[PDB]
Symmetry: D2
Subunit: 322 residues, 4 copies
């Protein structure tokens, strides 16, 4: 059935989710309401003008309590407490939770009490009880009854997991490490800020075999959009640069088609803006030391490709509602 969706939070992610969804060839989704922290005007404005994605070309019309976008209109409400939401009254099946404040199963499930049947977090789940899925990596494991609260992990994890997946299936990771240099407690505008990252461990969630085999560090840079992951892994099957890039390309044309983008052309950050893939490999940067120490650098468009994956998971969850 075509499930009814409500977007909680209308920031970068919520808005990106909306754009990605419109534009989709087809859909089993039906967005009906958006919970904001501002008015239906501010929403229509932010939804149209993006300092990153650019102006959203589609018929946008606001109203006191709603927002219409190419015919389809949707109720606008403002409640800082999910417990208060009319999720039951509005027959809300799935709730896209993108406020970053409800990431524990119990917190997110406030939407469940409010009457929603299932809630998906556009961020990593904190604690246990949530189901993490990374499209192209473990979506075949998706079963509607496993979790009420599901997660799509993070942007970094979504760029990493696909690559680790392939590398592992083809050469077998023994142990590895990664450094994610990504964009936006100190003036991050003038510094390069070291920070922790769970993306390393998060991959174990969607590739259990890699449990305890990866670890990472994050470095924050004053860059606009596009970010990158630096993956160094020690494999089992010794190989050569040519061949590592070979498998990554195959995957980008098959098993990971639409997920992993294989770029060989000499490019830079900006060039990958608006990319639908959640992980773009830069083949020119691949190195292999002594045939078994592989290093792969992959670019990922911060919240855009992540958003395409979020719509993909909401969709999967629809095509599978029980």
């Amino acid at each position: 059935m075509t499930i009814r969706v409500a977007i909680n939070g209308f920031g970068r992610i919520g808005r990106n989710f909306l754009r990605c969804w419109f534009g989709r060839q087809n859909t089993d989704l039906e967005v009906v309401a958006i919970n904001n922290t501002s008015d239906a005007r501010t929403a229509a404005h932010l939804l149209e003008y993006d300092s990153v994605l650019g102006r959203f070309n589609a018929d946008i019309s606001y109203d006191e309590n709603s927002i219409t976008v190419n015919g389809k209109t949707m109720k606008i409400v403002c409640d800082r407490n999910p417990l208060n939401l009319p999720w039951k009254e509005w027959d809300i099946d799935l709730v896209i939770e993108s406020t970053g404040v409800f990431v524990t199963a119990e917190g997110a499930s406030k939407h469940i009490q409010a009457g929603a049947k299932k809630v998906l977090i556009t961020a990593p789940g904190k604690a246990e009880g949530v189901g993490t899925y990374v499209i192209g990596v473990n979506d075949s494991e998706y079963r509607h009854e496993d979790f009420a609260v599901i997660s799509n992990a993070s942007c970094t994890t979504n760029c990493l997991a696909p690559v680790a997946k392939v590398l592992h299936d083809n050469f077998g990771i023994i142990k590895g490490t990664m450094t994610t240099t990504h964009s936006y407690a100190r003036a991050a505008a003038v510094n390069i800020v070291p920070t922790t990252t769970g993306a390393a461990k998060a991959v174990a969630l969607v590739i259990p075999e890699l449990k305890g085999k990866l670890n990472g560090i994050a470095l924050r840079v004053p860059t606009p959009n596009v970010s990158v992951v630096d993956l160094v892994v020690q494999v089992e099957k010794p190989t050569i640069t040519e061949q590592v890039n070979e498998v990554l390309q195959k995957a980008s044309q098959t098993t990971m088609k639409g997920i992993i983008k294989y770029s060989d052309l000499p490019l830079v950050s900006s060039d990958f803006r608006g990319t639908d893939e959640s992980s773009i490999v830069d083949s020119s940067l691949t190195l292999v030391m002594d045939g078994d120490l592989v290093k792969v650098i992959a670019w990922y468009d911060n919240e855009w490709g992540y958003s395409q994956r979020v719509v993909d998971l909401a969709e999967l969850a629809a095509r599978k509602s029980g």
Copy 2:
């Protein structure tokens, strides 16, 4: 003897070298002339006002052909051809070559023909014929007769080689890889620009045993100053994070004292501005996978620490003139 030095080029490095020299507790160096591409005014202006290091507090007074800084004055000349320089007439022993245009032995030796006995390149040497030295790593191998044209390698190499040195001395590197994310063909102000780096190979020069055992990749970011190196090596002696940071700290208090700074405090880029060490380790970032895959992240102040090392080598070359 106190050798007579002439600085060729008065940009980032030349200016930095001057500052670092003044302020040195002692010196066997006597700067007598500076070859610029502008007037003795522009020189005293750029020497006083630094958009990075800040205003240089010292009595600066220009002139039509000279520049006086705290008593000591020095001839200013402008020749875009080293062959034309008055190195012989001015009894110039050592020439600090910092224009980045003469990095091959034959190019740099143009200063030799012009009458200088020895020239030191503030950049990697191109081709063969030059002697690369990284203070704290192979400066004990210095012998005045080996090279007329010597190199101080690069900033990256000067941050990397010390670490590799210690790591290798203590656990023995088998193979490794590094990714330097450093500051300033496409608008680099809006991108993250992948680029090559010889620092990997450079280290083989000052640590021959690591020949063919390291490889790197560089990523250029729109950051102000400080940069960082990401070193992943597979060692022989299995160890633990606590112990890898333990040897690096010993080194910062002994063998690599003054060269390697061991920081454990939670800090960011800016915090390491004006640091004299050419390689600051961020202990909180050290990871060890399965006891034998080590990862070290080190910060380095672009041209400042490098300049401290340049004065260091000029000084060593003095205390050793034959």
Copy 3:
């Protein structure tokens, strides 16, 4: 007739010129050759991937000596000396000069000697002898025989002249001043750099009545694209904010249609990227003190809108070739 054009210099402007031209509904132009400083490959690459405008979607194919873009192909040559160019052999009518090195009538006319009949500078003319034209301001004054070397002024002048034009026609400028805060001798990446600007005087060239009535200052900022002009003028006919914005809007729908963009929506820099207008007024920012001290803030997309104007002038010059 459909004149034959050759683009000298393939940087920001040259490339922008090419994109703008393709995409034009119609044209009396026929680009036949491009003089670069690199190969036909680097050209096709730079023409396809823009860290600003984004990827150029059109069939691009290079070759050893040419470049094809959607059927139309064009000879690629590399000569740092216009005197050497085969402009006569190739029957080059108009030469788009965008290297910034030939801006004096005599320098630019090197293309004339090389056999070209007319040359247009994508920058301000230095000295006398060139014909400056700002589309929408003084293009009705264009006569094919007046000058062999014509100029399109600058981006700033192109944003300013249209506005001054309207304000003047409607209220009559007595005297004014302007400050242009625009994007990319000191690290301009970390500073706000004060610099001179001729745009103020340049306007006199295309609006003689304003001779000696305007003056300006420039402030350079580490911003990506979009820039802005701050125009403060003292008028003759006292007016009110509502009415000043009123005339600017009318103009944007008529006399200055396609030249001046009237934006009332609350927006920012990014929002005006890819704008074809060479001058976007931000009505919300209009102020009028004591009915006769007007201040108008206008945004301009650095080289893009400028490029649309450049194609407009080449076109005008074609439709008028004698």
Copy 4:
């Protein structure tokens, strides 16, 4: 008497105020307590390491409830409600309010109920009931009984009012307009953000004669520190550029000594970091149209000079406690 001061909020301004105070040749101020939102550790860390002002060189030692800096120690407390503070118990005379949340007289006076006799807002006052003073402009009007809650206006106003003062005293402003382009609802890191500014009106408070004679607009840029004001005024006494800069320089050596810095040297943003003056004039940028339209550009170090002025007012308030 040496009044007892308590700093509420320990961010940008609070920290800056502390530094400026230490380092003062003398003082009638005795800082005794600091109300934070974090621990006494985070406080001593942020007080020592500044991504802007650099490392603060002074003996800093924390503790569970206090912080000692060069002998003098001070109680650290954490209450998000001024009403709850121990201002009475700690005999707090003056409270430096720098949290930006209590800017209305009634809000700020919560510190009064808590036992403090006088509170000074490091920001513009909202509504009526507060006394705004701009050192060098209306500090002679200070009288301890006028206001329990006083304001130091803002950084912009503190750069603007001094200039307006002199200009008006010497030529008489009839009407004017200003545009402040200063540093840090949309990603301001990639845009130039237009925003409102009360600095125009603020000046009327410290220079009543200019009531209704000025108006401004602000443009936010992704710049690090220093900002700038663009002042265009129409005067009564016609003058010449040379003479407008002449009075501004006299003022910087007399009446506005220490307040206005007169710079004629060709410099940029960075060059004015750490400047104690709250308004630096860039003479090379002064323009005068038709003898009576004056334009002055002044640089101001965001929060540093402002902080020097804040300590100045606290001090004046001390030397005047009744």
